[PDB]
Amino acid sequence: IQRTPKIQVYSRHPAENGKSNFLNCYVSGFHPSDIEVDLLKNGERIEKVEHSDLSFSKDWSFYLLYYTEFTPTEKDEYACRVNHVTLSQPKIVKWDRDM
Template identity: 50%
Template sequence: MWFRLAVVALVFLSASCSAKQSDPKVQVYSRNPGEYGKANVLICYVSGFHPPDIVIKLLKNGVEIPGSTQTDLAFEQGWQFHLTKYVDFLPQPGETYTCEVSHMKNTPKSFTWEPDM
């Protein structure tokens, strides 16, 4: 039994080592069309990255929004990973909502939510 586990671990290790580094693709959107003063969900979908060393933050006017939820790390073909982070929010005029992504401890990049208004 331990031999099978060792073989599976070696296969996983060799596959993940052969995968090359890929920068994340980021999409920021809301569950419903953006409407000021109406409760909504801010969603940041990050995909196509490797290795899985990543930090995702949802920000309102540059400050992290408390109470956000992040899905479990999942992988796609070619050992690229994807995650989704989301939080309830109440968009107001003049406020800026962004998703900040830092991959491999690189300088964070910000992606702004654009309301459908």
């Protein structure tokens, strides 16, 4: 009846420190549609974050893409924080360059 979101955090182009890129948090496979997604820089919420319009897959589960432009520095830590009814605590997925 209720399906928990799958979370992927990744960049659009291959990461290269100092070069402007796009940080993506793709959330999919969830139901119901109400969801909170925040992108984080060193633990703090990036304020200007855009997201796609709500859509769904053949199994009726929803998906959304949250994105913002970021200039990666090797010291900066980025993550996606997601809250959903299926979750007790908000899930944080850190950005890994190899995934």
